[PDB]
């Protein structure tokens, strides 16, 4: 199926494109988009305080609903940088957003982060404790048939915190007539993948208490942003991971923080 009409998505992309335009009003995001274009970067950073200043209701929708509004945001950024530049937008296939500013009730620590903020955009203080070895996750896998001389390309998607069935995550190993394939690693695409473990900052925790920690997931242009012992502040989406195929569920949903931005101490 393909969606033909969606009032929410259409108005979201309209409002975003309007906000990110910004040329007539002080050129903040015009300057920022031009900067990331010239610097060859594709993860914009966006002041949620300015977003509230311009379109407050959009801001509340963004905060209280993360994945939908962020998908709308990144696609609006795709269209906007497509307008300002053509070959650059063709070269880079998806343009991320990160969030920043003041997040009033959602600026928390790993202790105060309850399930109330599930599927929402939190801003978590606290040190780093773990940093996994950075690994590529396959996202567009190209194969070549030695017998048939034809090249195919299976695709994948970020099913990190959504429903995921085996069909999406199959990886080809045979041709339609039993003619084994050869993968083209270089022609493929990849996305580095790291997982850190934020902990409540050791001073700010109440004394005599075993500290509270929250897992964080990192992707392209965010992996080597914070080593262990970093006084990080991660803005991201707090979500649930699906325990894979069940037949009996305890209802205990593990959680992560898909980081949409990473910062160190401001000093």
């Amino acid at each position: 199926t393909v969606v033909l009409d969606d009032v929410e998505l259409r108005e979201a992309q309209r409002d975003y494109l309007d906000f990110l335009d910004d040329e007539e009003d002080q050129g903040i995001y015009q300057s920022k988009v031009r900067e990331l274009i010239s610097d060859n970067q594709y993860r914009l950073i966006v002041n949620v305080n300015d977003l509230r200043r311009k379109n407050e209701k959009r801001a509340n929708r963004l905060l209280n609903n993360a994945f939908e509004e962020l998908v709308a945001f990144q696609r609006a950024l795709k269209d906007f940088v497509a307008s300002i530049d053509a070959t650059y937008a063709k070269q880079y296939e998806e343009f991320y957003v990160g969030l920043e500013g003041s997040f009033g009730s959602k600026h928390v620590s790993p202790r105060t982060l309850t399930s109330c903020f599930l599927s929402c955009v939190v801003c978590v203080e606290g040190i780093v404790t773990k940093c996994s070895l950075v690994r590529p996750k396959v996202v567009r896998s190209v194969h070549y048939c030695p017998a048939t001389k034809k090249t195919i390309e299976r695709r994948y998607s970020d099913l990190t915190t959504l429903v995921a069935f085996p069909s999406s995550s199959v990886y080809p190993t045979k041709d339609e007539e039993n003619n084994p394939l050869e993968t083209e690693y270089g022609l493929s695409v990849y996305k580095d993948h790291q997982t850190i473990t934020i902990q409540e900052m050791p001073e700010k925790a109440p004394a005599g208490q075993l500290p509270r920690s929250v897992d964080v997931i990192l992707d392209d242009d965010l992996v080597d942003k914070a080593k262990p012992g970093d006084r990080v502040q991660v803005v991201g989406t707090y979500r649930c991971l699906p325990g894979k195929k069940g037949g009996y569920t305890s209802g205990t949903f593990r959680t992560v923080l898909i980081a949409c931005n990473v910062k160190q101490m401001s000093k």
Binding site: A207, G208, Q209, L210
Partner: protein, 338 residues
């Protein structure tokens, strides 16, 4: 019912004092001073606290110090037998119960227990330490806290509490070298820190000297135990202790509050006469506790000057014996009236 009926008659029996004193530990010869101190210890004082801000303990702490071969361990085994809520421990670490509370997964039950210390387990009874002088550093700090505040404070794993341990301590110790030194004072005889010693009331210094009659009777008693194992009975004493502890709450309105003050002026004169271990108002409070305990011994409900006389006897005897040899003799011949 019949228990209260019988022990009321025993309380009126006119010699319940000496009767219980001799009843304490019938398996031992000699040491009537220890017997009286332990009767007062078993009965204990009465806690008091002006408002909720001047907590003074109501527990008679007795410390048994002396060279080996004096049945300190046998005494504390008897006290474990006779007292309810009576736990037994040692400073080495051999006993199944330690002195410092900790949190750990118990071996048998396999459950994340908070093993409270011996002091906490003695919450409203007696904790019986043996070899007090050989306790370790953390044991010293723990017993210091439990003596001072009766509130052991754990802060280890994720637990932050200041739970309570209102136990009477009945210790045992050996001097430096294993022979008591009358030439030197108790504080350097025993090898415990003066802040730890300060929180004690009776200091039974059990010397050991070669005496014909005492040695013969002691040996005859030990071989008596051997041949036989080739007052009150114990159950009655336990019931009397329980009944007294439950309800009798003596009060000290009728006590010679001016005689005691004059006597403490006299004691402070004799104590400033030397630079040795002096008298201080902690001794007044200990004597008050001992008087209240004797009142609870007889179930009088009100201190009488016989009770105050016995409290004076035990406290002054212990303090004189705690003083060094010269000052011991001087104070003895001065205050021999008591």
């Amino acid at each position: 019912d019949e228990d209260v009926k019988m022990i009321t008659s025993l309380s009126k029996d006119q010699q319940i004092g000496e009767k219980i004193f001799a009843s304490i530990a019938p398996s031992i010869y000699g040491h009537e001073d220890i017997k009286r101190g332990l009767a007062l210890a078993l009965f204990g004082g009465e806690p008091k606290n002006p408002g909720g801000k001047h907590k003074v303990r109501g527990d008679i702490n007795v410390l048994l110090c002396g060279d080996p071969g004096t049945a300190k361990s046998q005494f504390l085994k008897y006290i474990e037998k006779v007292s309810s809520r009576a736990i037994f421990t040692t400073g080495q670490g051999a006993s199944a119960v330690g002195l410092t509370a900790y949190v750990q997964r118990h071996p048998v039950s396999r459950e994340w227990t908070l093993e409270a210390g011996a002091l906490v387990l003695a919450d409203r009874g007696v904790c019986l330490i043996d070899e007090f002088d050989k306790m370790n550093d953390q044991d010293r700090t723990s017993i210091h806290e439990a003596m001072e505040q009766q509130s052991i404070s754990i802060s280890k794993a994720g637990i932050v509490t200041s739970l309570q341990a209102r136990c009477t301590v009945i210790a045992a110790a050996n001097p430096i070298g294993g022979r008591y030194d009358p030439s030197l004072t108790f504080s350097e005889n025993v090898d415990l820190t003066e802040p730890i010693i300060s929180r004690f009331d009776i200091l039974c210094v059990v010397r050991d000297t070669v005496d014909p009659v005492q040695d013969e009777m002691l040996a005859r008693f030990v071989v008596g135990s051997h041949v036989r194992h080739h007052p009150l009975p114990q159950e009655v004493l336990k019931k009397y202790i329980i009944y007294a502890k439950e309800r009798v709450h003596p009060k000290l309105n009728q006590m010679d509050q001016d005689k005691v003050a004059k006597m403490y002026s006299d004691l402070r004169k004799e104590s400033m006469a030397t630079g040795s271990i002096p008298i201080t108002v902690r001794h007044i409070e200990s004597m008050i506790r001992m008087a209240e305990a004797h009142a609870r011994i007889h179930l009088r409900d009100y201190v009488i000057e016989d009770d105050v006389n016995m409290a004076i006897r035990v406290m002054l005897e212990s303090f004189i014996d705690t003083q060094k040899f010269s000052v011991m003799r001087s104070m003895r011949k001065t205050f021999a009236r008591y």
